[PDB]
Each structure stands twice: as C-alpha cells, then as structure tokens.
Paper text:
The 32 LSU and 21 SSU [name] molecules are extremely short, ranging from 278 to just seven nucleotides. The structure consists of a total of 124 modelled proteins, as well as a Zn2+, a Mg2+ and an ATP, molecules in the SSU and a Zn2+ and two Fe2S2 in the LSU. One example, mL138, is closely associated with two [name] molecules ([name] and [name]) and interact with four more ([name], [name], [name], [name]). The contact sites on the CP are likewise remodelled, exclusively mediated by protein extensions from the widely conserved proteins, [name] and mL46. In its place we instead observe two proteins, mL150 and [name], which provide the binding interface for [name] and mL46. mL150 and [name] therefore act as a keystone in maintaining LSU-SSU contacts. However, neither protein features a substantial tertiary fold. Instead, each protein includes a prominent, solvent accessible, rhombic Fe2S2 cluster. The positioning of mL150 and [name], the arrangement of the coordinating cysteines and the solvent accessibility of both FeS clusters, highlight a potential that these proteins may likewise play a role during ribosome assembly or translation. We observed broad similarities with the vestibular area of the Tetrahymena mitoribosome, with the exception of a five-residue loop insertion in uL23m in [name]. The insertion, coupled with a stronger helical propensity in the anchoring helix of mL105, produces an additional kink in the late exit tunnel.
Author numbering:
A (entry chain Xf): 359 to 467, 480 to 550, 576, 590 to 626, 653 to 698
B (entry chain Xi): 2 to 445
C (entry chain XI): 1 to 35
D (entry chain Xm): 0 to 22
E (entry chain AA): 41 to 120
F (entry chain Aa): 1 to 67, 76 to 357
G (entry chain Xy): 348 to 415
H (entry chain Xa): 113 to 181
Amino acid sequence: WTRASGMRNPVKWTRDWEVLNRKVYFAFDEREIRRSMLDAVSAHRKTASLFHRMINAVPGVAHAMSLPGPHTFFLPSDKACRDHLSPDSLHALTERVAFLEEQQRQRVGGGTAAAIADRVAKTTEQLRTFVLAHLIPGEWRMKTLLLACGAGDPRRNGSLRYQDTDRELFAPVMYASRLGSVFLLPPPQSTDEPLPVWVQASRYAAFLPITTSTNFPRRRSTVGGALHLWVGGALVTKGDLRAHNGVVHMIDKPLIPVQLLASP
Amino acid sequence: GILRPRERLLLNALKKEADIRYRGRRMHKRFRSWAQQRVRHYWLPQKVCVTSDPQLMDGSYIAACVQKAATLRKHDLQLWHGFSKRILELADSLTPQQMGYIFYGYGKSLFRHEELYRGLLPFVAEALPEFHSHALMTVAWALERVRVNDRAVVAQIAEEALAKKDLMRPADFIKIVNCVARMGAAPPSLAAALSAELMRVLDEKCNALLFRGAVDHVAVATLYSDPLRLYLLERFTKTAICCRPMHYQKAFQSAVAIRVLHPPVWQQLSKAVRNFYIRLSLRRIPQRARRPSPLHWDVSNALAKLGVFHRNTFQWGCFWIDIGEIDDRRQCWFVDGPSDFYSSTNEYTEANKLQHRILSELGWNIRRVRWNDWVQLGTDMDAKVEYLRKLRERPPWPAILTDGPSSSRQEMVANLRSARDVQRALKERREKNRQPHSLVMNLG
Amino acid sequence: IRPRKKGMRLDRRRSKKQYKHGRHVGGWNYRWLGS
Amino acid sequence: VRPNQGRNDYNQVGGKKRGQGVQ
Amino acid sequence: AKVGPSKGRGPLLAKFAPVGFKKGFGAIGLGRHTKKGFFIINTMLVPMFKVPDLSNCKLKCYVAPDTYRIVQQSFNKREL
Amino acid sequence: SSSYLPRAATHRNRVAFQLFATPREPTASKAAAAARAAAEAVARSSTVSAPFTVQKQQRLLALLAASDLFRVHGLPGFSGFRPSSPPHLSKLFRGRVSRHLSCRRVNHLGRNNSGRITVRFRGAGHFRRLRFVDYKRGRKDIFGTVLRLEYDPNRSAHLALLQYDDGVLSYILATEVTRPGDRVVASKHASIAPGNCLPLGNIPVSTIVHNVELRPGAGGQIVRAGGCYATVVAKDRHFVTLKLSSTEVRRFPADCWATVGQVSNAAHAERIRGKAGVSYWMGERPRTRGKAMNPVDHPHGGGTGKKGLKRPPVSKWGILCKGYKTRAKKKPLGLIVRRKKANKLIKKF
Amino acid sequence: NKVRTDKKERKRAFPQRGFWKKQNFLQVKNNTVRLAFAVQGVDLLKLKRLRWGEVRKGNTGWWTDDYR
Amino acid sequence: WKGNWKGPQRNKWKWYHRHGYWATRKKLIDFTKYRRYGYHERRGLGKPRMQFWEDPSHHKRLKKSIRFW
RNA sequence: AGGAGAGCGUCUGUUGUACAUCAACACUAGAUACUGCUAAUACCACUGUGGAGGUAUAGUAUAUAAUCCCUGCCCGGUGCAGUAACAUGUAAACGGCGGCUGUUGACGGUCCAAAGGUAGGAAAAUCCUUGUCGGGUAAUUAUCGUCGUGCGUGAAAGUUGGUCCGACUCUUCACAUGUCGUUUAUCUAAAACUUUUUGAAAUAGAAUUAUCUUUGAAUAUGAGGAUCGAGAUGGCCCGACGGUUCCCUGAGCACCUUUACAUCCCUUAAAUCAUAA
RNA sequence: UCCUAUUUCCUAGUACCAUUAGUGAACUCAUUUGGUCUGAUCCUAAGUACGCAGUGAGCUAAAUAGAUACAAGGAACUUGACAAGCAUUAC
RNA sequence: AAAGGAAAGGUUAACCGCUAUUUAAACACAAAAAA
RNA sequence: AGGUAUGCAGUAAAA
RNA sequence: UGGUUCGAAAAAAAAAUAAAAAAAAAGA
RNA sequence: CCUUUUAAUUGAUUAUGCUGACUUUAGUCCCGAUAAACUACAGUUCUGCUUAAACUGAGGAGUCAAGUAGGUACAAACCGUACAAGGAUUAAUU
RNA sequence: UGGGAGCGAAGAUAAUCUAAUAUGUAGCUCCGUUCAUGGAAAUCAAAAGAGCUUUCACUGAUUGUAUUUAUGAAACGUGAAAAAAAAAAAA
RNA sequence: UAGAUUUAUAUAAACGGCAAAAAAAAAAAAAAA
RNA sequence: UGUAACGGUACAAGCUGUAAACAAAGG
C-alpha cells in the first residue's frame, strides 16, 4: 500500500530509450481523437464565426464535412476575411449567410415568393462552392507538409537552416569586438486546381545563435516558430487541430476560387 | 480485462506522455508554495449589500460597501460615482475609521476621482486629533497611489503620527514615512523628526518582515538622515534572506543613489556592507514586463520617421530607459504621461526627479516629451517630426528636473479626453492601413 | 478480519456483554468500586 | 472488488451527502 | 509479532508508516485545505503570547537567604 | 444485471403510457393539434402497405448488393498490423461508440451477491461498454436518419445511430437491410418498410418483424439476436399470432409494438474462431467434462481408465439433461399457442 | 539490528575462514575525513599516531630528531 | 519452489486494518483474556488503600466520576 | 535439438511448489438436450442475486473434438418423450450386437434372439516366451513392412487416414568420441591431510568388546571344545538381523458407490388460508 | 504613422507530517560479509578523462568434483550412446 | 477486432450565485461615469 | 488519460 | 518532491490523531 | 520418645514417561569466490566487474524495506545524525 | 449462575446399531439472583379431609417411563422451617 | 473538603421502535436469540 | 469504573499530569 504519486510515481516504467522512442511514435503519430472537424470548428467558432455560420447554414456542407473520409480543412479566420475581402464582398457574404439563417428560422417558425426559391438555390450553390474550396482529400499534417516542402532535407533546406543577423545591432553588450520548393496538394473538392504549398524562414530564426549553442559550418508576419508554412498564398497560423476524420489548419487568408473571383 | 495489442500500445504511450508532460509542467515552479496566507482581519463583521440605494446609506454602511467592492473588484463606474455623490453628501458625518476605509477602497481600486479626495481632505485635517494609525496610513497610502498631492495635509498627517508615536503601528508609520517621501511634503525639520522616530521604531519594534518595507530609495535619497541611511543599509544585509525582488530592487536603487549623490555616506559605510551591495549589483533581479505606452509608441514612430535609430523599453543598471539611441548611446528620451506628474499639475514626482538626476550625473543626455504638449499636435506627423527635430537641435536637460507651468483639473480632463480621441484615431488608421482589401468576389 | 466482514460486524462496546462477566486481576468475581 | 456491493445501503439514492444544495 | 506495537515499537507514527498515513502530534489548526491541494493560512488563529514589560524589574527568580530570618522575626514579634 | 439504474427506476410492471411525447407548442390543445398534424403527415407520406416477406427481403438485398488519396499521408503505421478496411469503406463505423449514450460495463464474472460462482466458465474478456439502446421507440411520428452502423460487444446484432429530425441521437437495433442514409419512423400510420416500428395490429400477415414487446410500452423483448426474425401468421381485433425463431407459435396483444425486418448480422453463425484464444478473448473459460472428475465431483466421474456415462446423462446437480423437460408443469401456457418440440423430431417430421 | 531481534546470530554459530575488510571504502572515507581536517590545518593522522605523552609540533618526528 | 520464492508478507496496512485495535474489537473472541497491546476486559483493582501514615489530603482515588469544570 | 521412420496425443497451451510436465486435463469444431423471459439453470434469507440490464444466430447442460472419407444392425431392457391411460416414438439417449450341426463350404438343417459385430484396423498401449515371409546385422525375444495364421478389436462412451508438432515411448544411419578392452599425465578445489581460529550430530542397559568348530528362542564378542601376546592412528565396509524415516489384523476411524436399509432437503402428488364475488 | 491588439503584472516567507536523495533484494525467508561477482536497461565508453570490490598458514599420498590433453581401436559400454563428443585450430 | 478513459480540476463558452473571494504588498500607465 | 498557485457553488464542449 | 486536501471512494474507521476543543459579535 | 490417629492419596532400576542437569560419540564433522606492500634517498602491486558527476534556468527519472542497516577511538558501548527559503552575500574576519 | 428464557449437537452407554440415556447438557443469544422467583384455588382429595406460594427430611429409588443399556428430587401423605394476605371511598 | 489534573478507550440512550455510522424520508426490506 | 499512550520524576514493575510530591502564616 502506498499513496506516493506525481514525481514519486510507484509505476516501474521502462528506461530503454528505444522503447521510449517507440512510445513517442505511438503517443503522437498514432494518437486517437474522438472529436470531429466540425467539433474543432465549433470550438474555434468565436475566431472563425463566419465559416462556422456558413457550415451550419448552407445545406449539405455539414454532411460533406462530417463524412469518414480523411480530410484536411483550411479554416480562415474572421480577421482574415475582414482584412483580405473587399468591403462589398464581405457585406455580400454576411448578408447571404444571414438570409440562409433567416429562411431556416422561418422553417422553424406569387412571383415574389417564387423568386425566394431561386435566390436560395443560388446562394446555397455559391456558399457551398466557397466553403468546399477549402476542403482537401486526405489528411495532410503540418510536419508532413513541411517535409514535402523540403524543410528537413539537408540538400534543400539551405536558406532555412543557418539564419543569422547583425548581432551587435541587437545584443551589443555581448559583441564588444563587433561594436567597432513548391509542393502541390490535391485540388479542393469544389475545384480542379491543385493547391500550392511552400515554406519560408520566420524573422525569429536569425536570432537563434544569439542565445543558443550553434554548429554552423564555414512586412514580416509575427506568427511564432522558425518556419512559416504558406498554403495558396495564405499563412498557417495554427496547425494540427487533429480530429477523428481529418485535420484543420488555421490560415490568415481565404482561398477564394477563380470562378467566384471577379475578373475585372 | 484485457486490451487488443494496438490498444495496449496506444494507451501505454499515452500514459508515458502524460507522465513526461507532468514532469515538464512542474519544472519552473520554484516559487509555488502549497501553503499560502490570506489576510482577513480587516473584514468587518457586519453584512452589506453594495447595490443598495445610496440615499439609505450612512457613513458606517457606505464605508463598508466601498471596502467590500474594492476587495471584490466590482469596479463599476456608475456604482462608484454614486458612492462619490453619497460620500460627498455625508462628508459631515464620517468618523476617522469610516474615512480610512473609504480611502482604502478608493486607493486600492485606483478610482481616479480627484474631486472626492479634494472634498474629503478638509474633514480629515479637521478630525486628525481623533485619527488612529490605520486611518492615517490609509489616507496617505491612497493619496500616494492615486497621485493626489496635498503637501500641507500630508505633513499634518505625519505630524499627527509623530504625536501619536506611542500608539502608531510600525507598519503604518513606515508606510506614512514612505508616502511623505514620495509626495515630497516634509521640510527638513519634519524629515529629521520622522527619521529620528523611524530609527527607534525599526530598532525596537520591527522584525525583518516589517523592516524590509522601510527600504525605499526615494526616502533614502530625499528624506532619511545619515545615521538612518547607515542603519538601513547595514540592516538590509542581515534581512536580505526574507526579501523579495521588489525589496532587492529598491535596496539596489538606494545603494546606487547613495553612491552617486552621497559619496561621503557611501564611504562611511563599512567594507563588508559595501561588498554586499557590490555583489548585489551582479545578481539578476527579476523585473516585470514593461511595454511602450500608446504615447511612447507615437513618439518612437515620429523619431523613426525623423531618422534616428533607437531602442525602446530596456534596462540599464537599475533603471528602465524609455528610448535609448543607438548611434550616440548617451542620448536618451523619456515620454512623460499624466501619471508622471501630480494630479492637475505639471510638477514631477520625486521618483522621476531622482531617476533623472542620477542618470544625468552618470552621464546620460536626457530629453523629455510632455503629453500636454504632444496632444496639441493631433494626428499630424510632420508637426511631430518637426517637434522632435527642434528638441534634438537643443542642449540636453540639466541634472535637476524642473517642474512645468501651472495647470488645472479642467485642463487635465480636457487633455485626457483629447488623448483618448487621438489614440482611437491612430489605432483605427493604423489597422486600416494594414488591411489590404483587394479580393473582389463576383458573387452577386 | 477483512473488509467485507468488518463492514457487517459491530464493535464490542455496542452491547452490554462487557459488564456481564467478573473477570479481573484477582479472579472471576470482580467486586466493582463502590459495591 | 466491491466488498459492500450487496448491502442494503450500497449506491443508495438520496442522502445528505449528495443533497447539499437541495431545498 | 512482526508488525504493531510489540517489541517496544509502540504506537504507529508517520515515520514508521508508508506514505499516506496521517498522524500529527497535537499542533493547533491555522487554516483550511483547499480543493486543489493547497492550504490557506489565517494568522488570526495564531496564539497571542501575553508578555509584560520585564525591563526595570527588581524581582528575581530566587530570594536572598536573609529573608527567612527577617520574616520569621517580624512574625514572631507579632505572635508573642 | 442490477448494477445500473436502481430498482426504483428500472422496475415497473404496468406502463401507463406508450407515446413518449416531447411537445413544442405552448399549450396542451396546440400540442394535440400538432400531434394530429404530424400523424396526418406520416399517413400522407406512407405509401407501402404490402407485407414485407422473406422474398422481398431477398430482393432488396440483391438490389443493395447490385448498387489512394483518402489516408494519413506520411504516416507509416505498424510493421505488420493494419485494419481490414479503411474507415471510408468498412461496413461498420470503425470509430468509437458515443460516450453520452453508453457507460462502462460492470463485469460480474459469473458471481452473485454472495461472491460464489453461479454462472460457470466465465472469464474477464476484453473491456466492454454498455450502450443505451432504445427498445421502446418512444418517439412517434418523427422521422430519423441512420447516420452509421456500429459494432456491439454485448449483442449479436449491429446497432444503428439514429439522428431524429430535431437532432436527438439514439441507438437502435439495425435490420439486415439497414444502410446509412435510411429514413425510419415509428407510428401506426407508417409504411411497411424495414426499420419502421408499428403496433402488431397494423402489420399485415406474412410480414417479418423483430424487437417485439410482451407488454405495450415496455420495450421490445422478443427476437433480438443477429439474423433472428418472427413471422406474422394471423390477426384478430385484440391479438396477433406470431411464429418465432424457435418454431413457437404465440399470441401477442395487438397494441404491442414491433419493428419490420430481420435482425442485422445474419452471418454471425458462420464465424470460425480457429483457436482457443479467440474464445479466451471473447470471455470464455475451459469446460472440464463431468466424467473426467472424481465421483465426489460429478455423477459421471470415477472408474479406472476411461469409461462411459454409466447412466442416462445428468448434470452436476443430478438432473437428467437429455430430453427431460424443465418448464414448470403448473405454470399456465397463457398466450402460448404451441411450443416447439425436440429438434430431432422437428427435422424427422 | 541493534535491538537484536533479527536472526543474524544463526550464521555466527558456524565457523568461517575470514571476512572481507572493505579497506578501499574505509580508506576513502578516512581520507575524506583527513582532508576535511587538513584544509583547516589539523594533522589528524599524526595526532592518532602520537605516543602517550609525545609532543610533535608541525610535521615532525624521528627524522627531525635524527637531523637536529 | 517455482521461480522466485514467495512467503508470508509483512504488510503494515493489512496488519493494522485486519488485526489492530479496532479490528480486534470487531472480532468475535474471548475479551476476558489479557492483551498487552490491545483491548481487553481483565479489570484492575484501581488505586490501593491508603497506608495509615500517608497524607489524606494527597491520597487520590477518582478521576472521571468527580470531573468538574 | 541432424538424416530416414513407428506408437500415443492433432496442434500452441494446463499441470501436481518439495518423488508423477505424461498417452493425463483443456482446446478450435460437429452434435444432442433444456429454456418464450419474472425463461431454463446456479446461489439456497429468497416479492433477492448472478444468468442479463442479454432474448432461441441467445443462455444453460452432456458428449465427441482441429483437416479428408466414413459413422453398419437393434426400441427386446432402462431412462425420457407422448396420451386420460394406450398406441407410438427417442439410441451423436444409457446400452446390446448368438449356438449346435451337413455339403475350405458358395449352399442347407435346427434352436434362440430386439439385433446377431457390419465397414475399416489388425500379433495392436488390446493378443503374446521369440506367430509366417521380407529389409537392416557375422549373429535381430528389437524395429519397419507383410500375411489375416492365432487371440481378437470395432465405428461421435467414435473407426481408418494426410501434413506438421512434443524437456513423451521407441527403430535405424552418421560424427568426433575415455561409454568401453583400460587406464594414464598436468592443473585447480565449497576435495582431502597437518596447524591456527573453533567446535556439533545421530547413537549409548553395563563392558576389561579375539579366531576356528559346535550348540542354542534354530546364522553368538560372552554357552561346550580347541586355539590365541595388545593399544592407538590412516583406510575399507565382512559382521555387530548395524542406525533412523513394506505385509496382515480390531467387538477402530475416514472417504467413495447405489436395485443395501433408515432419515432429511428438494420436485411431484396434495392440503391450507389469503377469499367476498 | 502597414506588428493579427500598441491589452500594466515579478516570488503575499508560507499550517501539519514524510525524506539520509548513492552501490546494493533493500521484501517474504534465514549459515543475513547489507554493498563485489552471477541479467537487461540506465552516459554517441579507445570499460565511460585512475570508479566499485578482493576472506588464517602450510603440504607432490591416494579417493572425489571438475578443467585440459590423449597413441591405435571407435559403442566392442550399458537396460538404454546415460554421460560424453562436434559446433576452435595455415592465413 | 477481441470494440477499449470522462469523477474532480484546468481551458473555451454561458452565467441575474456568493467576501465560503487576489496582501491595510507592490510595479506600471495619454485614462474612465453623468453633464 | 486525475486535480497547479484569490476560493466556494454551478451547465455545456473538447488533443 | 510527496502525503494531507477535492475525485476515484470507501464507518473498507491504521487507539492515543486531525482544516476536527460549544458551533460568530468577532470589539475591527 | 512412647501411645492413638492421619483422606499422606505415603515407598520408583523401567511407561521410545514429564521437567532438567550432566556424560559418549570427540576434541571428531563444520572454516563461502584472489590476493600483496606500506619501504636505509622520487614513483605507478595484481586481479574481478564496469553509469564513478555531486548547479550550470530542470530537487539532479521512481516505489518499497531498514519501527533509523555504511556517523564515531582497531567499540556487538556512550554520544550524534533525514532542515523543501539549504541559511557561510564566509570574495567575510584574520 | 448446573438459577430462568430461546435455539440446540456429537464424542460416550446400548459391548455393532435404533429408541432411550448422555440431556434438554456443551457452544451461541438474552435475564441478572430473597428488594428475586413465583402466588392467595373455577386446587388436591376422597365420601373423612387439607387449605396461596416457597425450603428441608421421610414416604422411596416406592408407583412410574424406558422394555437389550437406564432413567426416576412422581402424586397423595407424614415430620419440620418460614408464615401474610391485601394499609387502601374521599379528606 | 487548598489547588491542579494532557491524550486514547468511535457514547444525543440520566434513553427508547428494530435496522449500517449508539437512533438512517415513506416503499422496496426479509428476523426463533 | 478500569486500563493504557506520552510527558515529568533516581531516563522506573514506584509516584505522578506541563501546577507533573506538594498549599496548610490572605480582605
């Protein structure tokens, strides 16, 4: 009998480092998630309000996003939509989402009435196209995307591995002697153009040697980390929101399809 | 029961990762104590409802309500302005205990309503003979925290504490002396009397936990006498073990101020004490996060547009510098906001003057920006650039920081409102400039 | 005695059996203090 | 596993323990 | 026996028991356990020692040997 | 077992209601009007009225049979282990049972409140969860969609996750022809289609049913195992006669509800285990023969070398176990019309 | 144990040829003690080796007697 | 024996919960038998009679029956 | 623990801790029987619990077991089912499956019976001093194959087989070989002898306790006769029926069986109120 | 005036009880040197930049337990290839 | 496939609960009712 | 995949 | 760093122990 | 003394008797795995096995037992020894 | 508590065995012992009589029950001990 | 009987339904002590 | 009532309760 716990855990774990490495694999790559992609979207509804509303108000979209097939959903934020969409486009999107919600609420509760069906059909098709433009076949996790873009390849990761800065300009008291590859993802479900993905070095990478032991040989976004993953011209802000049937990646720009874009 | 082998492996790995997560989580909790203290011997035994109609409140009820709201962080503007109105109506009928609790609530909540303090102070002065230690301490403490300066009344409170020395609590006396020093209200005779009494209070009545509160660099520099300075600096070496980063920081600042402005006292110290403070100068004293204010950021933006390299909000020695230029490191700037002066006046605080003098004597060429003048520029950038250039083209400021012109509460309120409007406009037109707004959808 | 039986047994002093015997240091016919 | 599983009081409904907030 | 108070072991103590055994020695309580493993202390419950000003006190632990003679004579003068 | 909800909640001989109503309207009169409207809508939608027979089941099954990107990229799984089919192609869900509709199973391990073994040959087995399946189909006149089919470790049949039109989730027994996307309803006006639940008095003769209530509103109790089904033989005003999977003909009150179709997973009996370990996982323990023991341990035990039974077969407790009837003679037959005979006689006659 | 409740006396009823002396461990411990004393200017080993009534100041001995 | 040898265990939790003071109280045994380290009902004589030369002002006989404030 | 084979169990498993690791038990599967749900069965406070929060593709009971081909005849007996009772059914229900004679006898006679043991193994874990013939050997009470000669066995209380398996019982070939004719050399020791340290045990009626030959409660250190110089130490076990943990019997005990007897519990058969209609 | 917000937040001295933080079955047990040796793991090791541990003295008898090496023969042994033997040998 | 965690706590949401409630500690700081 | 630092009640969701 | 404490969850009570002494007028 | 009586449960070479003491076997069996030196002018014996770092922002990756098993004079004594803020900021004093 | 109440065995005798004896005993639970148990006749007896209840001796190991073993302070009665009936319609 | 007199010995029974925790909503719920 | 645990006392099979062997002379 004992009540020791925490740092005095009486469980005799193995110390074998190879077994612990296998445990790492099982605990991270092969971990099981109960929730679904829409569960994650709802959890982040306050930051992704517009897309949450569209998913819940456009018929068929929820059914498509709740299917077993492993999927990857690139979720834009309301901030991203506001920043990148023109004011008129944002107003139109808000008005149409509100219209669908209002028709749904009417269901809960001449030619003018006939036109309502046509408008509903048009709005549903357009918003379904928009929302499904972010759904991609397969489960593409963040590290897989980075390794596909080439980060981690010793032959290609140059310009991302040895970033340095003019140190004396930022940590002068320590430098008195100085004081003197585009990967392609399958097309969205509603389009045929495959999605380009690339990687870049963040502004924070250059400062690593100032505060870390290094073994080197002979505007800018504020998102954290050393590497930035760009998908279709949009930056991933929060990745690996894993689910049971896919993964959600948060992005800072909406991937509007060419059909919905205005040519002039 | 049994599990399928895949399930066994997955759950075992989850357990291992949970253990490692716990171990990693507890790594930085050096100063996490499972045993914790909570102060509750100031809570009154009577019950009150804070939202009750003020017209039914008396002094005893309103004071308790104010203190309870301050404790519970119920910072509602309507509620506290009703409190102010009712308290001003009841000014004639408050005891020193009730006035002390009211001042505690106002100061603790940092409710910067100058009119209430101004209207309550005359009754405090009149009733001073009946005041007790806690009430005197609380009045001084709240005034110091909110920057409501009344030197005559503060001096009267200190004199009352001296007269009631045999009844004053040591902590209350220490706080009163610190507040007097910070408000600059003691002429030399009162300063000498306070130092003489504080010496005996600390030597006879205060253990380490009470004494460490006496270590304040402003008081050491401007108020304490030489024997008191020597005693304080010697005693800190003995009482360091029980101190916290704030106490260490104030001790270090006191030592630097004595060294820079009182070399005779520094030399009158002993070699062991001097060694203690030299070794203290080598330690990493935990600071707390500081960031440029909106006014600081506006000044930095104007300076950068002018074309002067600079750095912001950094620590040199035992001081924090607002702006430190890079090309000529000795040139530095300070952006002075409403809280750097006393309410309704352009008179600098004692801490600000002490820091200015110490940095100037250590070599810094200081220049200063006043929000009262900056706000009159508006949102214009050319005007701000010209302002900063003209300031640069002029000599640095003397080692002694002189106060600005006279002002009034009316002008202070007007300038605060103008600063609010300018902040709003600048933030709006910053974020709008950031937003691209280039995607046009043919959805219609 | 194990938990299941302990959960159903009662303490010795919950009855009067303790006072119905005369066992003592001197024998089996204890004369109580105060007779 | 549960020594008191069969008792009349095992997993009894109600009680002051679980009815703290009930008026 | 091999466990218990026999062979001079006496009553059980946390020193001799496994971790989890709870047994103090008679100290007063000074606070409350929280719901998350903490303990909030209340200094109002600290006993207050009442000590008089011992400075300038002519009394001492013992009494001089002559006091017996002095008091005995002073009482005999009354009794006689 | 009784380790779940207490007796006060589980035991009720006479159920006073058969419709679990969840009205939305503010008043009782408007609730009644809405219920009538819903019943009329179900009646309007109902079109199929012919019996659902074995042959129609076969035709539907034949019709159903006639009618690389999707993976975790960069995820090299186990060296040898792999699921039999990916989630988007497996017949069953491949996921986890809903937590809100299930609880941990209390494993009694064949021991009663006395702690002694009463049910022999029981083992721990794999950990299991009890899931709350709606045997009542209490919600009437509301359509629901079958979203997925699920495995159940305590039950020989498959379960189906039903999402009612208002968002309520429940688990029901799945029929042999139940597929994701199916629409189901419980009502007296419902069409005769598999999965629908109707009173036995509204189901035409020759129809195949399952999950039959012994008492109205008390939840189906008869015909539950995978592949089992019962046939409607005759109907009168108050009683309906059913032929059961055991070849027993029994009458049921016309107000007892039932579901149309055969119980899913008719291939359960075709499973081959291959080794003792599969039964060990399933929760079995070795069965020692009576004649392998000593005479003190079984009536068949004893005797140098191997021997025969030396008497007509009896159990551990001295009861004939080959042809000896055990139903209480005085217990009335009640609604039982005719009870089956021995399988040898059935197959020889 | 010190209370003599164990059964360790049972083996001591039989002869053994010898016993390990643990001299490596004991000498490490002794030299640790000697270093602790010596850093303060004490010759513990010399004190332990002194004859009864013998006085030797500093690091002196028979060799000092010989050469003086 | 088979493999590693296992004998009677020394378990403080088990011993104290099964054979301690309260467990012995709950047992059904002869409680008139003297137990050195446990409950028993072999009652003692109490404080003996005072010798004729002792001080009655200091002789004591009762503790609980006369317990005042 | 290799190559080539046989027997028993299919197999991986369980297994008597401390004389039995096996051919014994279990096992995947094929069957039979009971059970309509407050199910049967089990526990035996019984309006309770496990069964099972399961519902005849389920649960319980009893055999036989995994793969292939097969699984003959008998309901006379016993049990069970069936019916008011019969009739009748049920053997993968418990069980059983001939004798004396004529023509080596296809084919007859006669008695008996419910049926008269079928197919297939077969000198066998059954029979037995080493059955006939063949391979291996110089020599084959062994082993394999074969005959069906002798004794016989025998069909889900299962018959005959294919492959693989076993700390199982056996046959054979090969290998370097101290297993052997038959032993020797060197070295070490939880081996022995001396010494230092230090110290038991089983046993003991008493002993100053010889060999031959005899006698004797019948195989004597002690009794008759004859003969004979003895103590310790090292070794060896001829004797001292050497010392200490198998067989019969009692007006003794314990456990097991049931067409031994008696009693009790249960299930039937009933009875009795609740109980009025 | 192009950072996704330019958002005040260090450690209130701290109830009671446990701990010898290392080698090591360190437990039950007792012919109990606590600690060496007898097995995996735990430090990118020329065994981890000198670590942990090391118990009276003698002495050619045989017998025994082992280790090594056996000429030529090669199972002739034995109930039985039990036990042994091979699985090293120019480089 | 043999079909596997959800009590208390933290996070987010919601919230007309309460000194059973963050020092009578401190730092920082263009900052805020009504009119 | 027990509970982490103003603390008692209290609903939902979930790497 | 653990126990304690909330949960698991337990009168399934470790004799000489406690957030555990008659339980708010507490005199701030 | 003698006399009379005594219910003393009154006589022991023996119950593989009971509780003990003391002989014989006998000065016999029993002695666990590797050991040396510490010096008449410098030093580094040999062997078995290898987690022996003890701050580098991290309580140094556990549980359990010793009812205190590595403190201390060639001690089976006396005395002493588990500090969660690690107290020596003792770069002091001299 | 060999007193009183409830439930209630076997070893032993019967030379096995059954009844009966052991025994209404042991264990278990409950009263708590003269300030108690009990009790002032719808009693017992003979055609005469006794006079609540209780203890002792005799009648007597009788008449009985058990029918191989044993059990049996029987009833009436006789000689003694103790002696009691009932304060009390209110005030 | 001058004062003082720690802790354990699970006690609202100086008392009344039984029944866990010296006494627990009705019912389920069961008894030779 | 009885007993015990710790503590004090000659570190105790005695005595004793933090007032732990003694107050007897108080407006």
